[PDB]
Amino acid sequence: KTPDDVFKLAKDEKVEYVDVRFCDLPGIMQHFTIPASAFDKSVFDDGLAFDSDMLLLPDPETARIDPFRAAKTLNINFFVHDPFTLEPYSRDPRNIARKAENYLISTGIADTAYFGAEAEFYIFDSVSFDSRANGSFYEVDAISGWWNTGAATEADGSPNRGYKVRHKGGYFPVAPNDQYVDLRDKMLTNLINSGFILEKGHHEVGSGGQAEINYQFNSLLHAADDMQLYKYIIKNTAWQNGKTVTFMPKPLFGDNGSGMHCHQSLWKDGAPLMYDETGYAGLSDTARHYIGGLLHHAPSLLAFTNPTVNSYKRLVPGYEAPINLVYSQRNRSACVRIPITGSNPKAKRLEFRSPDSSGNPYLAFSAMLMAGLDGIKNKIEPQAPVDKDLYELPPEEAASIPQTPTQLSDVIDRLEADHEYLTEGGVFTNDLIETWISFKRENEIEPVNIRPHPYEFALYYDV
Amino acid sequence: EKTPDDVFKLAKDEKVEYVDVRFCDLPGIMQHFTIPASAFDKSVFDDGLAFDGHESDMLLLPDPETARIDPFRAAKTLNINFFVHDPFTLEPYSRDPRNIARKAENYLISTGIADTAYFGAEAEFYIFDSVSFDSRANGSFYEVDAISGWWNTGAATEADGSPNRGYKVRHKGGYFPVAPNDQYVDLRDKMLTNLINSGFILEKGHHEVGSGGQAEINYQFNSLLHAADDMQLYKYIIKNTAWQNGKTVTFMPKPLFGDNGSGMHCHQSLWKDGAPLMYDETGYAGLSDTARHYIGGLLHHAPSLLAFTNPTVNSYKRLVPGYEAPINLVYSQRNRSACVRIPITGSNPKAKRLEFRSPDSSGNPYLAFSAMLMAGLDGIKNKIEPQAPVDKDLYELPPEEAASIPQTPTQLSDVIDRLEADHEYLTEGGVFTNDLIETWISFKRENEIEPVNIRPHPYEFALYYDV
Amino acid sequence: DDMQLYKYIIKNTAWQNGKTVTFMPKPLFGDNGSGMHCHQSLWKDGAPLMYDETGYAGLSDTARHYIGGLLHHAPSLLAFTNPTVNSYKRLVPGYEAPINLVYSQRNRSACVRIPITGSNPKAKRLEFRSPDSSGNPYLAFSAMLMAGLDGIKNKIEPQAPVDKDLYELPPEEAASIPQTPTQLSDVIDRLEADHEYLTEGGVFTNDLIETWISFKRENEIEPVNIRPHPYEFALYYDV
Amino acid sequence: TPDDVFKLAKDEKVEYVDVRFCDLPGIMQHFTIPASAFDKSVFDDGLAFDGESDMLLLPDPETARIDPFRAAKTLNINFFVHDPFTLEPYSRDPRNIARKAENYLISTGIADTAYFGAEAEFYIFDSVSFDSRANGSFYEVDAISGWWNTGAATEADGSPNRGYKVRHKGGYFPVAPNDQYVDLRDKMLTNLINSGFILEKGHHEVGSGGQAEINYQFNSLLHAADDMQLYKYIIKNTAWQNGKTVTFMPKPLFGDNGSGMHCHQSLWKDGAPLMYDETGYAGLSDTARHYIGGLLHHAPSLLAFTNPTVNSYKRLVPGYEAPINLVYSQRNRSACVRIPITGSNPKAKRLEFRSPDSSGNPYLAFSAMLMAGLDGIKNKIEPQAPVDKDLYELPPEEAASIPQTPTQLSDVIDRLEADHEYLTEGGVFTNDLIETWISFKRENEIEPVNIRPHPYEFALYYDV
Ligand SMILES: O=c1nc2c(n3ccnc13)=Cc1c(-c3ccccc3)cccc1-2
Ligand SMILES: O=c1nc2c(n3ccnc13)=Cc1c(-c3ccccc3)cccc1-2
Ligand SMILES: O=c1nc2c(n3ccnc13)=Cc1c(-c3ccccc3)cccc1-2
Numbered sequence A: 001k002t003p004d005d006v007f008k009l010a011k012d013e014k015v016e017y018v019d020v021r022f023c024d025l026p027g028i029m030q031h032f033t034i035p036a037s038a039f040d041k042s043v044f045d046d047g048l049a050f051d052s053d054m055l056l057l058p059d060p061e062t063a064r065i066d067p068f069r070a071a072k073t074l075n076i077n078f079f080v081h082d083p084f085t086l087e088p089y090s091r092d093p094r095n096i097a098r099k100a101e102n103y104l105i106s107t108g109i110a111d112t113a114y115f116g117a118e119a120e121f122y123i124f125d126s127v128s129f130d131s132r133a134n135g136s137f138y139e140v141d142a143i144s145g146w147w148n149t150g151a152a153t154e155a156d157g158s159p160n161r162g163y164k165v166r167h168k169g170g171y172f173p174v175a176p177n178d179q180y181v182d183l184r185d186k187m188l189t190n191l192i193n194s195g196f197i198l199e200k201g202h203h204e205v206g207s208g209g210q211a212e213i214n215y216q217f218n219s220l221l222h223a224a225d226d227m228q229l230y231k232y233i234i235k236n237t238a239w240q241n242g243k244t245v246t247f248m249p250k251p252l253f254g255d256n257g258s259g260m261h262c263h264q265s266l267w268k269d270g271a272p273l274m275y276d277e278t279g280y281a282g283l284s285d286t287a288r289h290y291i292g293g294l295l296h297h298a299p300s301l302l303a304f305t306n307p308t309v310n311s312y313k314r315l316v317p318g319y320e321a322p323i324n325l326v327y328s329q330r331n332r333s334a335c336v337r338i339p340i341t342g343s344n345p346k347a348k349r350l351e352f353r354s355p356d357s358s359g360n361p362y363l364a365f366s367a368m369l370m371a372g373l374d375g376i377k378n379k380i381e382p383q384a385p386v387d388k389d390l391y392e393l394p395p396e397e398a399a400s401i402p403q404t405p406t407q408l409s410d411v412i413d414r415l416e417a418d419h420e421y422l423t424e425g426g427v428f429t430n431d432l433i434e435t436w437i438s439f440k441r442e443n444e445i446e447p448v449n450i451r452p453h454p455y456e457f458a459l460y461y462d463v
Numbered sequence B: 001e002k003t004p005d006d007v008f009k010l011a012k013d014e015k016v017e018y019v020d021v022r023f024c025d026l027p028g029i030m031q032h033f034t035i036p037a038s039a040f041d042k043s044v045f046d047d048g049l050a051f052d053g054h055e056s057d058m059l060l061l062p063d064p065e066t067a068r069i070d071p072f073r074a075a076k077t078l079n080i081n082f083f084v085h086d087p088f089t090l091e092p093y094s095r096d097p098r099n100i101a102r103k104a105e106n107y108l109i110s111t112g113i114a115d116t117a118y119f120g121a122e123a124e125f126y127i128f129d130s131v132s133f134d135s136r137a138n139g140s141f142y143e144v145d146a147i148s149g150w151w152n153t154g155a156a157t158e159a160d161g162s163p164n165r166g167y168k169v170r171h172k173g174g175y176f177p178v179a180p181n182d183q184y185v186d187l188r189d190k191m192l193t194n195l196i197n198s199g200f201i202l203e204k205g206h207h208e209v210g211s212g213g214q215a216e217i218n219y220q221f222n223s224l225l226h227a228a229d230d231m232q233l234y235k236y237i238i239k240n241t242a243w244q245n246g247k248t249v250t251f252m253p254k255p256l257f258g259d260n261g262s263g264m265h266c267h268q269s270l271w272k273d274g275a276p277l278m279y280d281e282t283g284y285a286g287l288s289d290t291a292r293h294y295i296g297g298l299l300h301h302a303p304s305l306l307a308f309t310n311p312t313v314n315s316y317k318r319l320v321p322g323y324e325a326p327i328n329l330v331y332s333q334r335n336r337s338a339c340v341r342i343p344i345t346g347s348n349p350k351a352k353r354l355e356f357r358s359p360d361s362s363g364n365p366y367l368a369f370s371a372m373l374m375a376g377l378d379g380i381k382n383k384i385e386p387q388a389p390v391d392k393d394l395y396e397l398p399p400e401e402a403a404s405i406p407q408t409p410t411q412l413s414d415v416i417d418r419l420e421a422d423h424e425y426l427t428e429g430g431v432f433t434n435d436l437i438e439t440w441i442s443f444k445r446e447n448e449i450e451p452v453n454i455r456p457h458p459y460e461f462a463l464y465y466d467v
Numbered sequence C: 001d002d003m004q005l006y007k008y009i010i011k012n013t014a015w016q017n018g019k020t021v022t023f024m025p026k027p028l029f030g031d032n033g034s035g036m037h038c039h040q041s042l043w044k045d046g047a048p049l050m051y052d053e054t055g056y057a058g059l060s061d062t063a064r065h066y067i068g069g070l071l072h073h074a075p076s077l078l079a080f081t082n083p084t085v086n087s088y089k090r091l092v093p094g095y096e097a098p099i100n101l102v103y104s105q106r107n108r109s110a111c112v113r114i115p116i117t118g119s120n121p122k123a124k125r126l127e128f129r130s131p132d133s134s135g136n137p138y139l140a141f142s143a144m145l146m147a148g149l150d151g152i153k154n155k156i157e158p159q160a161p162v163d164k165d166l167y168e169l170p171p172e173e174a175a176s177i178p179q180t181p182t183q184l185s186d187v188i189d190r191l192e193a194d195h196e197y198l199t200e201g202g203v204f205t206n207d208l209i210e211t212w213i214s215f216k217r218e219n220e221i222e223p224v225n226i227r228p229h230p231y232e233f234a235l236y237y238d239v
Numbered sequence D: 001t002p003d004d005v006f007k008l009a010k011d012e013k014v015e016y017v018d019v020r021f022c023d024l025p026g027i028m029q030h031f032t033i034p035a036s037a038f039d040k041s042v043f044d045d046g047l048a049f050d051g052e053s054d055m056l057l058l059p060d061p062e063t064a065r066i067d068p069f070r071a072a073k074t075l076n077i078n079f080f081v082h083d084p085f086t087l088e089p090y091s092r093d094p095r096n097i098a099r100k101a102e103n104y105l106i107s108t109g110i111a112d113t114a115y116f117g118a119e120a121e122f123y124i125f126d127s128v129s130f131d132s133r134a135n136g137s138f139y140e141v142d143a144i145s146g147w148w149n150t151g152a153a154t155e156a157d158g159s160p161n162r163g164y165k166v167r168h169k170g171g172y173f174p175v176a177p178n179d180q181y182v183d184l185r186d187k188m189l190t191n192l193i194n195s196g197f198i199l200e201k202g203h204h205e206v207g208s209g210g211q212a213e214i215n216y217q218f219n220s221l222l223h224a225a226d227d228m229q230l231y232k233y234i235i236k237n238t239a240w241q242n243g244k245t246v247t248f249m250p251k252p253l254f255g256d257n258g259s260g261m262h263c264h265q266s267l268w269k270d271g272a273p274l275m276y277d278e279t280g281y282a283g284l285s286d287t288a289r290h291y292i293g294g295l296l297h298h299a300p301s302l303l304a305f306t307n308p309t310v311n312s313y314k315r316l317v318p319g320y321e322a323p324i325n326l327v328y329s330q331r332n333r334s335a336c337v338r339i340p341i342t343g344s345n346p347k348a349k350r351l352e353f354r355s356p357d358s359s360g361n362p363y364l365a366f367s368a369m370l371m372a373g374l375d376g377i378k379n380k381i382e383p384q385a386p387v388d389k390d391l392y393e394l395p396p397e398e399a400a401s402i403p404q405t406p407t408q409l410s411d412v413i414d415r416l417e418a419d420h421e422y423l424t425e426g427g428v429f430t431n432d433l434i435e436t437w438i439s440f441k442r443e444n445e446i447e448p449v450n451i452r453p454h455p456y457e458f459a460l461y462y463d464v
């Protein structure tokens, strides 16, 4: 969306520093700042050096004004390139994504992939945690937390006023029960100001400590950029107002997980490919195959989709979790749900409900698109839909319903075995997958695995 | 009433940035989500909004009447109450309290007895500074406190370190003393302002009254459904006025032991082709043939009716045999211990109504109001005659001459059984479904009656540890 | 007398070693209750009256009728047996507590369970499992025996014994088993209704029983009822 | 002999007798009866109780011990659970399972006695506290001697920090004052010798910082298991009585030693050892070889009984080289099975299974091991080549062919759920018992730990 446009923004707004941003492999953004003067034409054509060593080239589409910086700052995202060969670095997620958009163009099946994500998050007043030789602990807190019901007085001394208990009847009570109304307002304002579009099905929902704002869809790469931006604005708006946000799958035990339902659809020559009045749920064979690709590769898809150890405290056989490998229109417990849109072809999409916000959105959306394209290119048929509720059906008839693996170590094992569908088009390279597998095993899987669980003592000190 | 167009005017004049989509849960706690102002166009009134809570997905349709500017949100927010429909069939959801009241108001018309049922409810509440409580395996506790609480006469300093300045104790004489005994004057006025600015009408028999921690403000009547809408708004505004002044409110039936209960009195009337039915000098008190038959209906149905008018386990710490609590099934002109009570309307035709004295605010105003009107109508159908009025005292009149004055049931688990055993007048017209009531019977049993029943009371320790 | 003694000795041994004991039927929520399992037999001329091999579970025709008397008068018998408000926090439908008005040799869930004693005529007895130590052992034993006798005199035949599992037996097939009342106020109302098996022979007097009722109502039932439960705040402060 | 015990009860002026018996996962249960009530009729008729409904309890005279901790003079005896009507050993009493194993061992004519000796490590702390709430979870153990306390200004009781704490380079078993628990361990050893444990040549009290171990003489399978139970009871209580608190949990300390139970085994017939053969390896007959063959073959499921806790697998990890390598050796501490150097003496010859931990039920652990051992003989299962070189330092493609034990309790439970015939042979283990054990572990241990966030997850992921 034109270098010259970004230069207009720089002037109208009177920008004085530019925040160069880029994405580390496990998916936390990185930044440094240059003065506005040092940002010009030559930045877009040549790039910027930085440190091993990297050449950074900017994406004109991702330019945003920073609501939080005291100086007037414009943030832009960049693709990492190798300074010698000038060629897109292999393990830059923004590139893994860009190659995925381009692969989709070469197949000639469709030209654009539209992603839309619904990312939930927790708001807390404080968190502390710590692992030692002889002990370990964590504790999150918040004023409105139902476990603070018999509190003498609050954190800051002020009297305990009640209105905390997660009650019965609904999930989204009005104030004073809704104790973070004004915070979510600020967030939504900051999102609307930072150019997020909010139309029909888009809203701010708030269930006590947990909240969700959804915005309009976007093209795969830019959907992911939006997703990193959303997180950034949500986190910092809480930060700037004395709170602390976490997107982690399962911070509260015996309460709700924080999911990310991803809506995907394919378009070509300016028309939707997912609609067909005649087929089930109004789904065309292209869509049905795509779903079949997702359900076939789910076991290895979850490696990027739900890539933390914490992820599998949410995806656990119990809560009616999106772990059942079928598609549906009803079932919440099914992996792929289809949103009831109607006779409108433009809205017809499919919602993959397993993912969580803990992943790298660039690799996640890509991994999904790759799995779906595999479904299309191999005409895979998904096992028939399941519309009547799953909790009420014979134990044997419902034993034909396969499950997602329930551990990080497993999905990582599975990614290791079958990852062929990801190597297509030079998107995920066999190198990068080795790295993703090693990275998780060495830095997550096993360092968690060697540390005794607090609850283990409950069970076993007495033995 | 006001059309959709006025709502897009209000929003625009006020410079609303967000619109609050409110709908009611089954027990009667408002639910909401927020959408930007720009996303609130005319298609909202025609096509509706989607969201998801057997049911899964749901279509929500706005009520142009209930649009109000939130005084409390920092962002400029307009609130509108919605009806729940079937996304596919456009059919009202049989379990949506506002729908239920809608059905009630239509049914009334489908009988031709009248066209409009009016309600207006004086609802009482408590203001506290603090509340804490908690249930564990090896014990329980609760404690409300407030600065003006009489149990705090001996305090050395107040909570904020400030000296104790007296003027607390509940006295003998009257219930509504002036400052400084009335410590909650500025807060109550603030509440009043907020209700006035949020559009409530205060006129004749309408007042703000302050009895210690307990307080009450009564506002103008409204048609059954919109009366209940008003009822919600009223709680919201009190609650949130308190909250933003660092206090805490509660509408529960009995927060304090050995002290007053919080009670919601519902005045009913009926109207047709612009005129009131209830009036007629030639009969008792001013009551017409229909008015009396109505009253009969309330009285014959009370044991099941209470299941909606007096829902909570806490509802029956107010309604106790002794306190002169409205448990007696007769109508009256003088008795505060009587279920129905005809107010001194000074025989002008329009003001003739009847006040039900039993229900508390701890309910679902939609269902309550609806089920009340349902009882009153069945009473009109079978021309049901209510036992003779009682104008002489109940506290003092021969013990075996007034023995056959019947009593409402005094437990929750009791009244629910009456409901599970007789619910026809409610299902008449499909106003209440049988499916709805079955769940509300089950609610209630699982979620209220049973978990209370299985927890030891602290006082059981006073009684029994030593045994 | 032994029972009062036991209690006293238990309480005081603890008290003397810096602790504190309680026989209240349910002191901990979501944990076990303290019950009193009562074994009964009748004897004549130094020889037991309860044994018979050709009858069910080794019972005599005396023993069976006796049982019928307990189960028919249980709704009233509990007013002495389980005479406190706190008793019904133990005898609530849920924990599968001994509430089902049937007799067994298997069930932990029935009021009367016959102790497996095999072929010894002396050792055959009946264990009435509902009572708690919160009552008066004098009045409680008394009323058990009194109800047991009205069963022999009138020859009450108790419905079929159930060895089969009370936790899993078809929802409408076992919907034909009477429960005890689940509230003190109930068993009191039901003692006021029928208490004839008690005043037979002038053992319990109509007066005594009338005091007991007024004692339980005005000193226990009513003062608990008018006092708000902490869990009510958990339920309703928000309304 | 029954009569020994009555004279024991008499001589020691015993006033109470402790009726003991083993629950399913492995903690002993008890009720006390007066000494007056304990007579000839106990050993003949039995004793009645309930846990299913009513059960009969029959005493094992061998297990009779004076209780050194109870102030009232008390005698502890273990019992076997029987059905009151049929007089049938109960299908589920671990002590019966051990008994029944010992008999099946005779029924095959393979050997008549199965000898088990156990070296069970333990930890001594001054305090433990923990809990798991909705918004939080924690644990902490502490010991004044602990190397994390080097910088403490004062101790718990206020007296000054005197040093001599930190795990130091070169030595695992230092002398005092580094050995801060010398007088406690002594009391422990005294209490065992007093309680009828036998200590001889290879038997010794060792003490590694806060971890400690005391071996005692072998016994026949059932009694070995009884001893193990007893050994735990005395260790635990000896500390308890001295204001300390002990744990047999496999892995209480992150970044430190795990506690293991090494299980020495051998078989005998007609009073002749079956394990020796001067024709190698390590002087091992084919009986001994096939036994090992079975151990190593069934190890993937055997661990659901030898290492049956979620904690067990924080010790058994591909880390410090914990005994997870499916080979037998003479050198590697990282081998599952190892043969102790006995040299020429044919009676000392045995095989040491090194994976097990004391978080177990020894009756089941020991039975499961022997059952696996016999299937090894009956099927002449041949175990893969004995590794005598280093496991941590060898060509990666020649060490890739070395199989590993499963790394997680969830797995071994499943592996047990797949093949477990070798256990059900002769009716030692019933399919009924094994099933309960699976449901038990899955629903009570595997599933509850799983759904509870780990504190280090907040370290990794709060910032995601
Ligand atoms: O006009 C459009 N309308 C829609 C759209 N789209 C992509 C390109 N042009 C359009 C995409 C779209 C979705 C959608 C599709 C996939 C993922 C998320 C949202 C839902 C409702 C309506 C639309
Ligand atoms: O002019 C009126 N004046 C009154 C009225 N009403 C309904 C329609 N028009 C009127 C209704 C009304 C009540 C009333 C009726 C029912 C419930 C509560 C108040 C009391 C006093 C005065 C009025
Ligand atoms: O030898 C006797 N053995 C018993 C007995 N009894 C009464 C008079 N003589 C005897 C009474 C008795 C009971 C028993 C009977 C009723 C209530 C409680 C215990 C239980 C077991 C054994 C006996």
Ligand SMILES: O=c1nc2c(n3ccnc13)=Cc1c(-c3ccccc3)cccc1-2
Pocket (backbone or CB within 6 Å): D115, D116, D117, D218, D264, D265, D266, D268, D347, D348, D349, D350
């Ligand atoms: O004389 C013996 N010497 C020994 C023995 N044993 C059992 C029966 N008789 C003997 C068993 C034994 C072991 C041994 C065997 C298995 C497990 C632990 C120790 C070690 C050294 C010496 C012996």
